[PDB]
């Protein structure tokens, strides 16, 4: 879905690179780890920069693991992560990039939005929507929906996957609900509000059937009950919204199906508060009333979610890509400056050590 | 105590509660 200019690798190929043999840097890091001493971020940056084969990706994965479990794990630089993902894409190793992204705790791979988009678009271009969905879920887990391009791409992938899904595990429901709620909240259009309602419906089904802890545990979600009430609040907000804002019929149908299926361990809530299972009937009544209201005002969209998202993408992704490319240009320049500063510090320290030793 | 605080204590001590005590007798029972 992204243009050739966005995914072009020429300018990262053109970065100033100081060449080393990966074996030498690997041996130096091995000796440093044997001595129980900290390895510099510059060393791992050089190691990742000098991947020249698919087997060197296997070696660099191990050394990324080792650096993550070292005293200077915090100092892994952003350009190193970007270069790792670039190398993985270059040498047909998207599986390794996805493995390191999924196990980000063990490898410290926390990409920026541009790198998420690169990986997601590679998977989309190769029609591997399962791995694209995995990347979208990883974006959700890191709460990296701060850039419009990532939001649009994730919404497209999520709706494409949902259009062909019937059997839902509650873990899958939770993941889909979070991954559609987070980008939907940042888009003030019909697609965004429909995504909000759909995700709230899914999360509310999970809350009612499996409990609220199943919803908020290890997720970027709040620990307050009332997700179905929040869906109904989205409906009410759309009722008082400007004309252009509408709601897809599919999202409303999903919410209705959830409510119709719901109306047919430690206690976390205060006993004085009314439980959601006791509020299901009034939720159903409110849903019916608000559905009739929205139908009356003509605030219901008949186009499917996937088609609407496709149209919105074709309308906005070009400008989003332009902005992202400019930010990427700026980031590359700043990364070059920082790397040169690190190299200078390392060289100054070595020469000073030499003037110490000559005495 | 307010009802909300009593409910908070009941949640805090789930399964390890006694019967709630009301106001004590104003005078010492004879």
């Amino acid at each position: 879905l992204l243009s050739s200019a966005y995914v072009d690798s020429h300018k990262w190929e053109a970065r100033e690179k100081e060449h080393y043999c990966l074996a030498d840097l690997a041996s130096l890091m091995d000796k440093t780890f044997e001595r129980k001493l900290p390895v510099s971020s510059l060393t791992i940056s050089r190691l990742i920069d000098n991947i020249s084969s698919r087997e060197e990706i296997d070696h660099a994965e191990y050394y990324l693991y080792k650096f993550r479990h070292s005293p200077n794990c915090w100092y892994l630089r952003n350009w190193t992560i970007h270069t790792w993902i670039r190398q993985c894409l270059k040498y047909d190793a998207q599986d390794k990039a996805l493995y390191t992204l999924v196990n980000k705790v063990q490898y410290g791979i926390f990409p920026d939005n541009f790198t998420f988009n690169l990986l997601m678009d590679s998977f989309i271009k190769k029609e591997n929507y399962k791995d694209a969905l995995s990347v979208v879920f990883e974006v959700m887990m890191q709460e990296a929906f701060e850039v419009p391009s990532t939001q649009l791409l994730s919404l497209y992938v999520l709706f494409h996957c949902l259009a062909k899904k019937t059997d839902f595990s509650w873990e899958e429901e939770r993941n889909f609900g979070a991954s559609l709620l987070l980008p939907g909240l940042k888009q003030k259009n019909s697609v965004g509000f429909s995504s909000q309602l759909y995700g709230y419906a899914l999360l509310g089904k999970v809350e009612l059937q499996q409990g609220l802890r199943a919803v908020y545990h290890n997720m970027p979600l709040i620990w307050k009950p009332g997700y179905l009430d929040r869906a109904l609040q989205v409906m009410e907000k759309v009722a008082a919204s400007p004309e252009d804002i509408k709601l897809c019929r599919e999202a409303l149908d999903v919410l209705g199906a959830v409510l119709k299926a719901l109306t047919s361990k430690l206690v976390e809530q205060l006993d004085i508060e009314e439980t959601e299972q006791s509020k299901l009937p009034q939720y159903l009544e409110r849903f019916k009333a608000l559905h009739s209201k929205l139908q009356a005002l003509g605030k219901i969209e008949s186009e499917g979610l996937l088609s609407l998202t496709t149209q919105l993408v074709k309308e906005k992704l070009s400008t989003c890509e332009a902005e992202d490319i400019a930010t990427y240009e700026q980031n590359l320049q700043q990364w070059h400056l920082d790397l040169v500063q690190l190299i200078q510090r390392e060289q100054q320290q070595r020469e000073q050590a030499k003037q110490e030793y000559q005495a | 105590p307010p009802e909300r605080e009593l409910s908070r204590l009941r949640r805090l001590y789930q399964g390890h509660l006694q019967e709630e005590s009301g106001p004590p007798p104003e005078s010492m029972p004879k």
């Binding site: 479990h69 070292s70 794990c73 915090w74 980000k104 926390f110 970027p220 | 908070r8 805090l12």
Partner: protein, 211 residues
């Protein structure tokens, strides 16, 4: 006095061996969830914590899944959420992960504390980092989570003296010629009763010794 040099040697050697064989957080604060005992010492945890130990997450179990170990993010605690209605949280400023942990789920943290809606001026070390009591505030919820309107905190400014002490004060005044009819009064404006669950100074806290 006949010098005791073996004592000097023993103390120095023990100090060196304790400084070089330091047990790490991953070893000290590991827990066997089936028996809820510490493998390092074998001591079982108190009963009232058991459920939490099996349900909630340690702070760095959350931070190790975030970029930069979650610097600048807001982290709250389950116990604070249950006990207090006003917002309580830490704004992280510095994190020192325990690299020896497989999942990087042990370590130390520093931040700015806000307790019951009152923010502190400086950043200090966070206590109970290893407790299974921690929750991460979502970014899209922070604005709603941090919202707080400071209610009027008007408490008693003074209290009566105890009976006998009041009588003694009045008797002393009358003996010294003073005939004032004003009641003796104890000022309690300078006594701020801090809630027992407020974070203490982790910098002053000790550490389990290696055995």
């Amino acid at each position: 006095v006949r010098p005791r040099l073996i004592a000097e040697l023993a103390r120095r050697v023990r100090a060196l061996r304790e400084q070089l064989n330091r047990p790490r957080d991953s070893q000290l604060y590991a827990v066997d969830y089936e028996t809820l005992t510490r493998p390092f010492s074998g001591r079982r945890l108190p009963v009232r914590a058991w459920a939490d130990v099996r349900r909630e997450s340690r702070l760095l179990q959350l931070l190790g899944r975030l970029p930069l170990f979650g610097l600048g993010r807001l982290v709250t605690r389950k116990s604070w959420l249950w006990q207090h209605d006003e917002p309580c949280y830490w704004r992280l400023t510095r994190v020192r992960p325990d690299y020896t942990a497989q999942n990087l789920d042990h370590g130390k943290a520093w931040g700015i504390l806000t307790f019951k809606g009152k923010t502190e001026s400086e950043a200090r070390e966070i206590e109970h980092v290893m407790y299974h009591d921690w929750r991460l505030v979502p970014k899209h919820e922070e604005e709603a989570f941090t919202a707080f309107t400071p209610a009027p905190e008007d408490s008693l400014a003074s209290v009566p003296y105890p009976p006998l002490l009041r009588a003694m004060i009045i008797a002393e005044r009358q003996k010294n010629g003073d005939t004032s009819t004003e009641e003796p009064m104890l000022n309690v404006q300078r006594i701020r009763m801090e809630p027992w669950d407020y974070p203490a100074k982790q910098e002053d806290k000790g550490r389990a010794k290696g055995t």
